[PDB]
């Protein structure tokens, strides 16, 4: 197929795109020693589907006069290659003057005139951080469909970054509300060693401490399975989870880390626990393949509630068919992409669950288009055509808008995030295959269909700790922070000298003390 | 201005001389920071001294282009300015092996975040960057940061020094206070990793609020500080490690003073170990012992009499002035670049040739230098760090002597703490203060663990007919032979008739 040629289109204004259209095997990741080019080794269907979503959105906008009436909107899509060097090359190309092959080191944004109006940003949060920092200097407005790390919310370092997916903080606030509802006061917090997991643990540990949720253990699990230190570390994490007597574990970890942890947990025969999931695991590109999932004990977590695109699959198939026809072609950015036929992109891939990111890409295109529609002060059928909009001019309107996806209004807030609802999904194993069931919703408030909750047995799990002790007891602090206590009962022959952590004192010889008593007593 | 010198080859330098999104921020909005001015002068002294040294670059002049950076708030523009060549234009192309930039090497930023930001840009060109104060361990990844080097140890060695200080004085039981920043969480996690391997238990870890010293404090933040100090007071641990920027700790220590807290050992990380502003608070001398882990000072001989279109003209620094421990890193960075260039040009005494150099080759040569500078041997470990000595300083308030007194020295290549001297403690008789979670057993007593931490145990007597062999186990008793017996809590058996 002549498919990679479909990544560029002319127009009055042009949108840049960064997508995971290709990748490489691990053998390439050695230290760079000479500044040569990096080859396109491996194809990626996810990037192709997201690029198709952007193409579809722009095609719709060019058909329907509701936005940018009389204007033509173009696009220019590039592969990230999941590589910062290639991503930086593409980012630099976006910012160069049209027709030129170079960029000028001017001191401030007003002197530039880049060839694209906005950039629909990369898939991963790492490239989002990098390219957001770079783009902010030029005030190039960047909308990401996938990058959820909350560090990007900072308007000081990211004054021009937007996204059509909520940040991790909202998901973790939903999780904290879930723990608060079931009175799970005593929990263990785990995260992946990647920045995703470290920032997730930071956010959750900040949110839980404010609401009286006591974290028994806070730890990181590795991404890899290639050194004995990692086996020892997962064994130690299992030891920590066991010794703390926790029954509910929050696991804000990537799918590879969860796969490692769960495989080793099955290997070591860990007893059932409640596991509170995160989206990147819960959507399970990898984890749900494990043979013995049902022994892990219970899986539960929140998931996005965005709209759906019924026509996307037929659009993809239609344009692949068009790319297969030489009579159409008579009318690279990823050389491996041309080797792909329809059967390699079977509908079974699209019927899985990728809907969230595809819709987010569609909505990002629509957000940029609506912002431009506002900046040009468009009427019905007419626009302020007498001037050419620069990106920093679009940025002014992009903060103060509402835009329509398919039957869904969205708005960028003061920190560039959208507001969205969530479903609460519980894994059901009574079916012959693990399947997600909706058991509640979150929209800033948590609604639970508790009559539908699939707990094991006729009981709801519990994990709790004492916030204060009784008078006839001695305190003892526990937890990653000294937040809660376990209680000691003073046995006969000893007394609670202080109403405090101080251990019970042995009884005075000429006296005696019964159980739980606070003082020595004459034996007569 | 003095921000620029012409020459055959130019070094780039980034230093922070100063402390509506459509409004472009400018450094002049912030007060002068004298440390960055000292570092700039260190670079200038090094480069001009090299130009005077006929044996290093005979007939070749090192120039420089220095640009002021307001920490993170301006990091893109200087890099583009450094990279551009003809008419301030920078070509975009796939292969840069044949391209020559304005500068051949960069003396990079101070903050780890800014170092990473600049590194991600320069990695595209493999233009070498040497940095002087960013201790973050993440910079050791040369897949991620191929062109980045350091003239200073990393957080690995600071935490090693802390842990070996704990081990030497037999402290089993510590508290960790961290900032909300990436710095505090990074160092807290690293310390948590290191202690578990060495037998030290962290009682609890707690996060300080992001306060600023001159500004007013809200009621909830005040209560947060109150809660943290309550947790300090309740605990039996009396060794406290604080990973926080100095400016934040004024309020925290004011609260600690207000609650009349006293009797702890405070272990300071390099970000506040030598702060005069905290030190001059007269009442800190009553809170306990303050020990700080920091890079060791190296005196530059001639430096004192030398010192005394945008972001290249800041006149205010002089009258603000009218960094000793960090200066040597900048000095040695300039000298490292100079030696790498001296090698790259194929140069020899009085016989240089001014060949055209592309930075990616100078990086390859910078990895290769090994020479003695100012009586210390500087070369780069494969992970990019120069092995400079660290030291441990105790704060002193007798103004007859220096505020910070060296009490120990740490060697990263030998990876051990050495030359420990007489710390003067807060105790009643200058005895070493001890923090242990539980008291050691009497002979013939078994340990019974309490809770999660290894250091927590009850001591319980062995019953008659059982004995405990301390060379063999300590957590359960073992029975006497079939014709032996024992005196209850006793290490040994005896024969029955």
Author numbering:
A (entry chain B): 23 to 353, 367 to 388, 393 to 563
B (entry chain A): 25 to 43, 52 to 340, 358 to 371, 381 to 555
Please give me the paper's original passages concerning this structure.
Sugars and other sweet-tasting compounds are detected by the sweet taste receptor, a member of the class C GPCR family. The sweet receptor is a heterodimer composed of TAS1R2 and TAS1R3,3,4 two type 1 taste receptor family members that share the distinctive architecture of class C GPCRs: a large extracellular Venus flytrap (VFT) domain, responsible for ligand recognition; a cysteine-rich domain (CRD); and a seven-transmembrane (7TM) domain that mediates G protein coupling. To address this gap, here we present cryo-electron microscopy (cryo-EM) structures of the sweet receptor in the inactive, unliganded state, as well as in the activated, sucralose- and advantame-bound states.
To improve the resolution, we combined all particles to generate a global reconstruction at 3.1 Å resolution, then performed local refinement focused on the VFT/CRD region or the 7TM domain, obtaining final resolutions of 2.9 Å and 3.6 Å, respectively. The tight packing of the sweet receptor is facilitated by interactions between VFT domains and CRDs, with the VFT LB2s held together by loops extending from the CRDs. Phe519 and His520 from TAS1R3 CRD are wedged deeply into the cleft between the two LB2s, effectively clasping them together, whereas equivalent residues Ile510 and His511 from TAS1R2 also extend into the VFT layer. This configuration reinforces the dimer interface and would enable the VFT domain of one subunit to directly communicate with the CRD of the other subunit, potentially allowing efficient cross-subunit allosteric coupling. Notably, such an arrangement differs from other class C GPCRs, where the VFT layer and the CRD remain structurally separated.
